[PDB]
C-alpha cells in the first residue's frame, strides 16, 4: 500500500541570508519570523512527495560522499531582490550545477518582493535572464507567502512534465 | 560451464550497542556467508551495516556477485566472467528490493552476454543504480591470458602474482558533483550521461598462470588502509594502500596452494576488525563528548570541545576527534575542513545519525594453470581420452612439471553445498587420492 505516487528531491540554494529557510518553513509549515522539510502534494490526480533541503553552506563545513550517483530532481535558486550582491552571484550558482550536475530542472526566486521601497534587483532584467537559459522566474515573499506555493508547485509540475 | 550469482542474504544485524561486546568470531558467523565456485574462485558476502542504538530486524544485502566459467571446444576451462555489483542506497525492504534487483540483475547480464567487455557494457546499458567492477579474460592460442577489466563506481580491483606481489589495481572512482559532494558512478548513469569515459576505467592486460584477481565493494576495501591516488577537479581516484594490502598475505607464504576461500577469509577478516574497532570506537566518543554537557560550558564549536579535551588530559579523545572529523577515521566518505570553525552541533547531529558499516562482498579468482586444467577435463570426461591425450605432447616440457600438476590438483578443495553461512562451510577434497595416483601413472606411461 503506497504512501505517495512520486517522491521528488528539492534543492534550494543561493547567498546566505536571502531567505531559502523562510520559503520552506513557509511552504512546509506556514510560518515565519530549519534546512529541511517535508511536505506532500497533489497534482494532476497524483501525489508527489516533496523533500525539500536548504543547503545553507553546508560545503563551506565538510565535504560528504553520497551513495546515490542520482542527484535531486529540482534546484530553485533563490537571490534577494533587495541585494544586488546575491542577484550577482546566480550565475556562479547556476554554473555549480551545470559544471557538475544531467538536466536538473530550475526555478529562478527572486525572494523579499514585500520590500518595495528596497528593491533594488530589475525584475525585467532577471526575467529576461533567466528566459535566455529556459528557467522560469518567479518573485515570492516569504513573509506574505506571495508565490511561495506557486514556486514549488510550479517546479514539482515541471518535473512531473520531464519524466 | 559453471555459472553461479549470489543470492539475496537477509540478517538480522544488531545494533552496536549490542555488538559492543562481540568478539570478531561471533560478529563474522551472524553477518556473513560463502559462495565457493572452485578451489579457484570464492566468494564471501554479507553485512556489516549496523545502527548504534535500534536493531535492524531485516537487513538486506544490496550487494551481488557472480562467475561464468568458460572452456574451449574440447570442454578445457580456459577463462571466465566475473562481475561484482554494489546496490545505491537503501538501508524499507519494499525500497531493499528493487535496488537488490538492479544490482542482481546487472550482475547476470554481464555474465550472460558472450561479447567483449566494451560491447557487453553496451548491450547491459541501453531510477534505481548500481555500481559494477567486473572483468572477463581467456587463454588466446600463441598469447596466453588476456584480461579485460571494467570498473564503474568505487568497487575495486587488485591484481596480484602467485607470490601475493601486487601487479596492477584497477582504482575506485568518485566525481565530484558540485556542493560539497562526492558520487561513485554507477552502470545506469553510464547510459544516461553525455562523457561516458569519466565514469567507466578501462584495462586491458596479460595476465599469467597462478595470478590472483581480487574484485571487492566499499563495505570491505573501505575498511583497510587506503589511499588517495589522485583528485581533479571533478574527480577523485581511491585505493588500498600497497603498502598495507601486502601485510595481510603474510598469513599465505607457507601456503603450497591456498584455496580462493583462505585468501578471501583473510582479507573479510581485517576488514571486519578494522570495522568492529571503529563502530566502539564512534559509540565510545559519543558517551564521552555528552558526559561533558558542553552546552552547559559554552563550549559551542569543534575547536572548543578539541581545547577543552586537550587542557583537561583527555589528549587522546581529542585526537580521537580530529581523525574522525579530518582524516575521516570512519572511511564515510565525510572530512571537515580543518581551516574554519564548525558547530558542534553539526558535528553531533552528524555523529549520533551515522550508521556503520554495509553491505561487504569480495570475490577472490585464481587464474588457472593450462597443464592442470588439461588434466581436469581429461578426469572428468574419459569418454573424450581420444581428444585430450595427444594434447598433452604440447603442454608437458617435463615429468617434474607434472608431477607439480598433480600436487596443486590434490590440494584442491571444493565446498560441495555451494552456499552456506560462513561458521558452516564445509570443504572437502576436489579429488581423491587414487583417482590422481592412477591418471598420473598413466600419463607418465604414456609419455
Ligand atoms: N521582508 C522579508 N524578509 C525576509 C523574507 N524572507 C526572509 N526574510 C528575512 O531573512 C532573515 C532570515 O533569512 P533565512 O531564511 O534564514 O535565509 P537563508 O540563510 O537563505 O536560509 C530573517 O531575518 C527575515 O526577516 C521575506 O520574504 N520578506
Ligand atoms: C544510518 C543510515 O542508514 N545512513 C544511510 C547510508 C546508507 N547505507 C546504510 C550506508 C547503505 C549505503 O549506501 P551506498 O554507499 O551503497
Ligand atoms: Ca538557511
Ligand atoms: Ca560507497
Ligand atoms: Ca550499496
Ligand atoms: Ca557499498
Same mark, same amino acid.
Given at each position: 500500500?503506497?504512501?505517495?505516487?512520486?517522491?521528488?528531491?528539492?534543492?534550494?540554494?543561493?547567498?546566505?541570508?536571502?531567505?531559502?529557510?523562510?520559503?520552506?518553513?513557509?511552504?512546509?509549515?506556514?510560518?515565519?519570523?530549519?534546512?529541511?522539510?517535508?511536505?506532500?502534494?497533489?497534482?494532476?490526480?497524483?501525489?508527489?512527495?516533496?523533500?525539500?533541503?536548504?543547503?545553507?553552506?553546508?560545503?563551506?563545513?565538510?565535504?560528504?560522499?553520497?551513495?546515490?550517483?542520482?542527484?535531486?530532481?529540482?534546484?530553485?535558486?533563490?537571490?534577494?531582490?533587495?541585494?544586488?550582491?546575491?542577484?550577482?552571484?546566480?550565475?556562479?550558482?547556476?554554473?555549480?550545477?551545470?559544471?557538475?550536475?544531467?538536466?536538473?530542472?530550475?526555478?529562478?526566486?527572486?525572494?523579499?518582493?514585500?520590500?518595495?521601497?528596497?528593491?533594488?534587483?530589475?525584475?525585467?532584467?532577471?526575467?529576461?535572464?533567466?528566459?535566455?537559459?529556459?528557467?522560469?522566474?518567479?518573485?515570492?515573499?516569504?513573509?506574505?507567502?506571495?508565490?511561495?506555493?506557486?514556486?514549488?508547485?510550479?517546479?514539482?509540475?515541471?518535473?512531473?512534465?520531464?519524466? | 560451464?559453471?555459472?553461479?550469482?549470489?543470492?539475496?542474504?537477509?540478517?538480522?544485524?544488531?545494533?552496536?550497542?549490542?555488538?559492543?561486546?562481540?568478539?570478531?568470531?561471533?560478529?563474522?558467523?551472524?553477518?556473513?556467508?560463502?559462495?565457493?565456485?572452485?578451489?579457484?574462485?570464492?566468494?564471501?558476502?554479507?553485512?556489516?551495516? +549496523?545502527?548504534?542504538?535500534?536493531?535492524?530486524?531485516?537487513?538486506?544485502?544490496?550487494?551481488?556477485?557472480?562467475?561464468?566459467?568458460?572452456?574451449?571446444?574440447?570442454?578445457?576451462?580456459?577463462?571466465?566472467?566475473?562481475?561484482?555489483?554494489?546496490?545505491?542506497?537503501?538501508?524499507?525492504?519494499?525500497?531493499?528490493?528493487?535496488?537488490?534487483?538492479?544490482?542482481?540483475?546487472?550482475?547476470?547480464?554481464?555474465?550472460?552476454?558472450?561479447?567483449?567487455?566494451?560491447?557487453?557494457?553496451?548491450?547491459?546499458?541501453?531510477?534505481?543504480?548500481?555500481?559494477?567492477?567486473?572483468?572477463?579474460?581467456?587463454?588466446?592460442?600463441?598469447?596466453?591470458?588476456?584480461?579485460?577489466?571494467?570498473?564503474?563506481?568505487?568497487?575495486?580491483?587488485?591484481?596480484?602474482?602467485?607470490?601475493?606481489?601486487?601487479?596492477?589495481?584497477? +582504482?575506485?572512482?568518485?566525481?565530484?558533483?558540485?556542493?560539497?559532494?562526492?558520487?561513485?558512478?554507477?552502470?545506469?548513469?553510464?547510459?544516461?550521461?553525455?562523457?561516458?569515459?569519466?565514469?567507466?576505467?578501462?584495462?586491458?592486460?596479460?595476465?599469467?598462470?597462478?595470478?590472483?584477481?581480487?574484485?571487492?565493494?566499499?563495505?570491505?576495501?573501505?575498511?583497510?588502509?587506503?589511499?588517495?591516488?589522485?583528485?581533479?577537479?571533478?574527480?577523485? =581516484?581511491?585505493?588500498? =594502500?600497497?603498502?598495507?594490502?601486502?601485510?595481510?598475505?603474510?598469513?599465505?607464504?607457507?601456503?603450497?596452494?591456498?584455496?580462493?576461500?583462505?585468501?578471501?577469509?583473510?582479507?573479510?577478516?581485517?576488514?571486519?576488525?578494522?570495522?568492529?574497532?571503529?563502530?566502539?570506537?564512534?559509540?565510545?566518543?559519543?558517551?564521552?563528548?555528552?558526559?561533558?554537557?558542553?552546552?552547559?560550558?559554552?563550549?559551542?564549536?569543534?575547536?572548543?570541545?578539541?581545547?577543552?579535551?586537550?587542557?583537561?588530559?583527555?589528549?587522546?579523545?581529542?585526537?580521537?576527534?580530529?581523525?574522525?572529523?579530518?582524516?575521516?577515521?570512519?572511511?564515510?566518505?565525510?572530512?571537515?575542513?580543518?581551516?574554519?570553525?564548525?558547530?558542534?552541533?553539526?558535528?553531533?547531529?552528524?555523529?549520533? +545519525?551515522?550508521?556503520?558499516?554495509?553491505?561487504?562482498?569480495?570475490?577472490?579468482?585464481?587464474?588457472?594453470?593450462?597443464?592442470?586444467?588439461?588434466?581436469?577435463?581429461?578426469?572428468?570426461?574419459?569418454?573424450?581420452?581420444?581428444?585430450?591425450?595427444?594434447?598433452?605432447?604440447?603442454?608437458?616440457?617435463?615429468?617434474?612439471?607434472?608431477? !607439480?600438476?598433480?600436487?596443486?590438483?590434490?590440494?584442491?578443495?571444493?565446498?560441495?553445498?555451494? /552456499?552456506?553461512?560462513?561458521? !558452516?562451510?564445509?570443504?572437502?577434497?576436489?579429488?581423491?587420492? /587414487?583417482?590422481?595416483?592412477?591418471?598420473?601413472?598413466?600419463?607418465?606411461?604414456?609419455?
Amino acid at each position: 500500500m503506497p504512501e505517495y505516487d512520486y517522491l521528488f528531491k528539492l534543492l534550494l540554494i543561493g547567498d546566505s541570508g536571502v531567505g531559502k529557510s523562510c520559503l520552506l518553513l513557509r511552504f512546509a509549515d506556514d510560518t515565519y519570523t530549519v534546512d529541511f522539510k517535508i511536505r506532500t502534494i497533489e497534482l494532476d490526480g497524483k501525489t508527489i512527495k516533496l523533500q525539500i533541503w536548504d543547503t545553507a553552506g553546508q560545503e563551506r563545513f565538510r565535504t560528504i560522499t553520497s551513495t546515490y550517483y542520482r542527484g535531486a530532481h529540482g534546484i530553485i535558486v533563490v537571490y534577494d531582490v533587495t541585494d544586488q550582491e546575491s542577484y550577482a552571484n546566480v550565475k556562479q550558482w547556476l554554473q555549480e550545477i551545470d559544471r557538475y550536475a544531467e538536466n536538473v530542472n530550475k526555478l529562478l526566486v527572486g525572494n523579499k518582493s514585500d520590500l518595495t521601497t528596497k528593491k533594488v534587483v530589475d525584475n525585467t532584467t532577471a526575467k529576461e535572464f533567466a528566459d535566455s537559459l529556459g528557467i522560469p522566474f518567479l518573485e515570492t515573499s516569504a513573509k506574505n507567502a506571495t508565490n511561495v506555493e506557486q514556486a514549488f508547485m510550479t517546479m514539482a509540475a515541471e518535473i512531473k512534465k520531464r519524466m | 560451464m559453471d555459472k553461479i550469482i549470489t543470492g539475496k542474504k537477509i540478517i538480522f544485524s544488531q545494533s552496536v550497542a549490542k555488538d559492543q561486546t562481540k568478539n570478531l568470531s561471533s560478529f563474522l558467523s551472524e553477518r556473513f556467508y560463502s559462495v565457493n565456485q572452485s578451489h579457484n574462485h570464492s566468494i564471501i558476502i554479507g553485512s556489516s551495516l +549496523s545502527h548504534q542504538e535500534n536493531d535492524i530486524e531485516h537487513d538486506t544485502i544490496l550487494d551481488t556477485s557472480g562467475v561464468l566459467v568458460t572452456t574451449d571446444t574440447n570442454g578445457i576451462v580456459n577463462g571466465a566472467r566475473v562481475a561484482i555489483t554494489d546496490g545505491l542506497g537503501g538501508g524499507d525492504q519494499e525500497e531493499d528490493d528493487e535496488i537488490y534487483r538492479v544490482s542482481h540483475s546487472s550482475c547476470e547480464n554481464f555474465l550472460n552476454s558472450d561479447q567483449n567487455i566494451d560491447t557487453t557494457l553496451s548491450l547491459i546499458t541501453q531510477h534505481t543504480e548500481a555500481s559494477m567492477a567486473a572483468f572477463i579474460y581467456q587463454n588466446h592460442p600463441g598469447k596466453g591470458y588476456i584480461g579485460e577489466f571494467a570498473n564503474i563506481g568505487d568497487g575495486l580491483i587488485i591484481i596480484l602474482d602467485k607470490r601475493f606481489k601486487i601487479k596492477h589495481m584497477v +582504482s575506485a572512482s568518485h566525481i565530484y558533483r558540485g556542493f560539497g559532494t562526492w558520487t561513485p558512478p554507477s552502470l545506469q548513469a553510464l547510459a544516461t550521461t553525455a562523457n561516458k569515459d569519466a565514469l567507466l576505467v578501462r584495462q586491458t592486460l596479460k595476465l599469467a598462470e597462478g595470478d590472483i584477481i581480487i574484485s571487492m565493494t566499499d563495505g570491505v576495501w573501505g575498511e583497510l588502509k587506503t589511499s588517495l591516488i589522485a583528485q581533479t577537479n571533478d574527480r577523485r =581516484d581511491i585505493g588500498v =594502500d600497497k603498502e598495507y594490502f601486502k601485510t595481510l598475505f603474510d598469513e599465505l607464504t607457507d601456503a603450497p596452494y591456498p584455496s580462493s576461500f583462505d585468501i578471501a577469509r583473510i582479507i573479510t577478516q581485517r576488514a571486519m576488525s578494522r570495522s568492529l574497532e571503529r563502530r566502539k570506537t564512534l559509540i565510545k566518543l559519543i558517551n564521552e563528548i555528552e558526559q561533558q554537557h558542553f552546552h552547559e560550558k559554552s563550549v559551542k564549536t569543534i575547536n572548543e570541545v578539541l581545547e577543552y579535551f586537550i587542557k583537561t588530559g583527555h589528549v587522546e579523545t581529542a585526537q580521537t576527534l580530529k581523525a574522525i572529523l579530518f582524516e575521516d577515521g570512519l572511511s564515510d566518505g565525510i572530512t571537515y575542513f580543518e581551516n574554519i570553525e564548525i558547530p558542534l552541533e553539526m558535528v553531533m547531529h552528524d555523529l549520533k +545519525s551515522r550508521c556503520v558499516g554495509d553491505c561487504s562482498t569480495i570475490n577472490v579468482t585464481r587464474i588457472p594453470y593450462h597443464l592442470d586444467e588439461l588434466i581436469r577435463g581429461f578426469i572428468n570426461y574419459p569418454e573424450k581420452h581420444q581428444i585430450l591425450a595427444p594434447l598433452f605432447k604440447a603442454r608437458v616440457k617435463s615429468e617434474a612439471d607434472l608431477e !607439480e600438476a598433480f600436487h596443486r590438483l590434490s590440494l584442491e578443495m571444493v565446498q560441495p553445498e555451494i /552456499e552456506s553461512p560462513i561458521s !558452516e562451510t564445509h570443504f572437502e577434497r576436489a579429488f581423491k587420492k /587414487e583417482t590422481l595416483d592412477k591418471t598420473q601413472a598413466v600419463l607418465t606411461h604414456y609419455f
